[PDB]
Design an enzyme around this catalytic site. Sequence first.
Site, short mmCIF file in Angstrom:
data_model
loop_
_atom_site.label_atom_id
_atom_site.label_comp_id
_atom_site.label_asym_id
_atom_site.label_seq_id
_atom_site.Cartn_x
_atom_site.Cartn_y
_atom_site.Cartn_z
N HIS A 1 0.16 -2.71 -7.80
CA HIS A 1 1.49 -2.65 -7.20
C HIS A 1 1.45 -2.61 -5.68
O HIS A 1 2.53 -2.60 -5.05
CB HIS A 1 2.31 -1.46 -7.74
CG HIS A 1 1.75 -0.10 -7.45
ND1 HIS A 1 1.59 0.39 -6.17
CD2 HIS A 1 1.38 0.91 -8.28
CE1 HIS A 1 1.11 1.62 -6.23
NE2 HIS A 1 0.98 1.96 -7.50
N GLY B 1 1.55 7.65 -1.27
CA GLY B 1 0.34 7.05 -0.77
C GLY B 1 -0.94 7.56 -1.40
O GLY B 1 -2.03 7.17 -0.95
N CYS C 1 -1.79 6.78 -4.36
CA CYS C 1 -2.19 5.76 -5.33
C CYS C 1 -3.58 5.23 -5.02
O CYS C 1 -3.94 5.02 -3.86
CB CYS C 1 -1.19 4.60 -5.31
SG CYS C 1 0.52 5.15 -5.26
C1 LIG Z 1 5.94 -0.25 -7.01
C2 LIG Z 1 5.97 0.93 -7.97
C3 LIG Z 1 4.97 0.66 -9.12
C4 LIG Z 1 7.36 1.19 -8.49
C5 LIG Z 1 5.55 2.18 -7.21
C6 LIG Z 1 6.50 2.66 -6.10
C7 LIG Z 1 6.10 3.90 -5.30
C8 LIG Z 1 4.80 4.63 -5.63
N1 LIG Z 1 4.52 5.82 -4.82
C9 LIG Z 1 3.76 5.75 -3.57
O1 LIG Z 1 3.65 6.76 -2.98
C10 LIG Z 1 3.12 4.46 -3.04
C11 LIG Z 1 3.25 3.19 -3.56
N2 LIG Z 1 2.55 2.37 -2.81
C12 LIG Z 1 1.99 3.09 -1.83
N3 LIG Z 1 2.35 4.39 -1.98
C13 LIG Z 1 5.15 7.07 -5.23
C14 LIG Z 1 5.80 6.88 -6.56
O2 LIG Z 1 5.16 6.74 -7.55
N4 LIG Z 1 7.25 6.95 -6.58
C15 LIG Z 1 7.95 6.79 -7.86
C16 LIG Z 1 9.23 7.63 -7.81
C17 LIG Z 1 10.12 7.38 -9.02
C18 LIG Z 1 10.46 5.89 -9.12
C19 LIG Z 1 9.26 4.94 -9.05
C20 LIG Z 1 8.18 5.29 -8.03
C21 LIG Z 1 4.27 8.29 -5.47
C22 LIG Z 1 4.81 9.61 -5.02
C23 LIG Z 1 4.02 10.85 -5.26
C24 LIG Z 1 2.68 10.75 -5.98
N5 LIG Z 1 2.17 9.42 -6.44
C25 LIG Z 1 2.94 8.18 -6.21
C26 LIG Z 1 3.85 4.14 -6.73
C27 LIG Z 1 4.25 2.90 -7.53
#
Ligand SMILES: CC(C)(C)c1ccc(N(C(=O)c2c[nH]cn2)[C@@H](C(=O)NC2CCCCC2)c2cccnc2)cc1
Lengths: 299, 299
Positions: free
Chosen positions: B39, B141, B143
């Site tokens: 992603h 971040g 991930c």
């Molecule tokens: C594109 C996709 C798959 C929807 C996505 C979007 C954002 C991220 N999150 C990144 O922080 C991040 C993404 N890319 C760089 N950083 C964060 C994340 O999951 N919020 C979710 C909140 C609910 C709705 C979907 C996403 C995250 C926060 C705290 C701990 N773990 C991960 C992970 C995946």
Amino acid sequence: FRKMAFPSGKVEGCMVQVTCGTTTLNGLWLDDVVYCPRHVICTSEDMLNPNYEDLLIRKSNHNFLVQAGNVQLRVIGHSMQNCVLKLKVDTANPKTPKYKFVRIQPGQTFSVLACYNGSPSGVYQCAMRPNFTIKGSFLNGSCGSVGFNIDYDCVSFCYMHHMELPTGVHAGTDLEGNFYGPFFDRQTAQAAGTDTTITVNVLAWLYAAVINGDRWFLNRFTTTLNDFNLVAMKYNYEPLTQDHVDILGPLSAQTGIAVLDMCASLKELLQNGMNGRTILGSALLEDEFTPFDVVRQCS
Amino acid sequence: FRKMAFPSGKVEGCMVQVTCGTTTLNGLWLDDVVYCPRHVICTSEDMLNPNYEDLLIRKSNHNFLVQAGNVQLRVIGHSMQNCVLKLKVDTANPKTPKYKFVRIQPGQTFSVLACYNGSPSGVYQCAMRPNFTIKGSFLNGSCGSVGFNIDYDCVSFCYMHHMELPTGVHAGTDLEGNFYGPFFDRQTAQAAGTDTTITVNVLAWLYAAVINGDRWFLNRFTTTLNDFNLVAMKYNYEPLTQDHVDILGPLSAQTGIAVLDMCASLKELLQNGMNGRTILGSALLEDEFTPFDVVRQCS
Ligand SMILES: CC(C)(C)c1ccc(N(C(=O)c2c[nH]cn2)[C@@H](C(=O)NC2CCCCC2)c2cccnc2)cc1
Ligand SMILES: CC(C)(C)c1ccc(N(C(=O)c2c[nH]cn2)[C@@H](C(=O)NC2CCCCC2)c2cccnc2)cc1
């Protein structure tokens, strides 16, 4: 929200095995010196009241077997600095990191790299209790394991493990060999003082709870430092100082809850208990997270 | 008795930063391949329903910036394996350890090396919940951070972190890119199943309590597996199997308490609560210690 330790790689390359006779424990190999507890030179007939100067006179360099992974380091000198033995070896550790030796404050936390026979086995986060004990997870032969913090690229060594007290808590030294607390490296009856609760750390953890959405314990009230401390001292809590309030500033600013407002919340939690509610999944007040720890884990 | 993680050094030398446009996260650099969540190639206009095949077609090698410490690795190929991106780089990681890719079982534990911008920040011990979520400590971040176990000299990678669910638990994949559980790397409503308590792990932790002198909950009774499971299922506990009993054998032998005797103790704790008593300093039943974890920490 978890107990989080520092990555341990920089420390792992410094752990060696140190054997003296039948006794094996761990040493810290920095440049061409291995640091380890001096009680490695004890026998069971010495442990009750050792004379370490005399015991060290009787030792020769060849009475110390130091193993790095599976290479034998040659001890070419040995000396005693307070309660740590310094074994000079003929090679510098090529994995020596940048480091300092620091003496920490009660209430401060550090990471422990628990080792046996010179090999790392686990890593966890610890706090130095107000009575200078640590509530560690250490088995026999864990002596010489170290506690540390990492700042930028530098390992700050603050603790070398020495012994368990019969009450099951642990005592050790800074890396210059001075014990934390009133303890001695001899097999005698040694009491730690009464243990108290680290008030500023409980406050940091309530802030961590607020940051993570646990808010049920917030109340409308505020208090003064003086009236807080009057209550806190009845429940075996360390006094809260203006320095502690200043230290909690970033957490106050992130949540919008003033320090003395959170103090009012902690005051009513002490006088009422939790009524079967939990905070951050715990039914007890947690005091081994510093304000710095909370900020790092929540930033 | 503490949550203890594996030493993290072998993993620290594998973490790199991976940037794609405005998005930065972590990758795992093993030999000449960097693994990271696919992603990373998403934009906000893509996140709701991404077509990853099409999105990856549009990318070129030069759209992927991979940084090791502060050296830029040259991406010379890119491909997708289920939900992980594999970026082929023109250098092999000289700090590559011996490793395997493993898919773990619900209830099993692992260590997490939490990273931001390719740099390790902390290490802690985790369990894979029965509903294939993890209750991690991960910020934005994070991930690409990985979970792992160490066996002898080999790192077993079992988890790569992908996303947070709106309920605040976390979801990710094995290192072949298959999600644990029914989740997808898209910004849509995704429910985890009902979470249950890992029964064999609670039993291991009661044994840890007995080993550490907390014994107040032992009772005279015994039970059958069948009658235990009838009660356990009313309190949202996973069924206990004969395999689980066999797995608990070493702990039974060390303490002299039969498994079904400890099961009788857990049965009455569930039906009565703790009456304000604690076990191992906790007022709740802990279920993120496997029998293996307890044996290692107590041996
Ligand atoms: C594109 C996709 C798959 C929807 C996505 C979007 C954002 C991220 N999150 C990144 O922080 C991040 C993404 N890319 C760089 N950083 C964060 C994340 O999951 N919020 C979710 C909140 C609910 C709705 C979907 C996403 C995250 C926060 C705290 C701990 N773990 C991960 C992970 C995946
Ligand atoms: C000689 C001296 C100073 C009395 C001593 C004796 C034994 C050790 N202990 C070694 O395990 C050990 C010693 N040398 C190699 N291993 C253990 C230890 O403290 N038992 C104490 C028990 C109460 C009475 C005094 C010693 C230990 C166990 C668990 C965790 N931490 C350390 C430490 C110091």
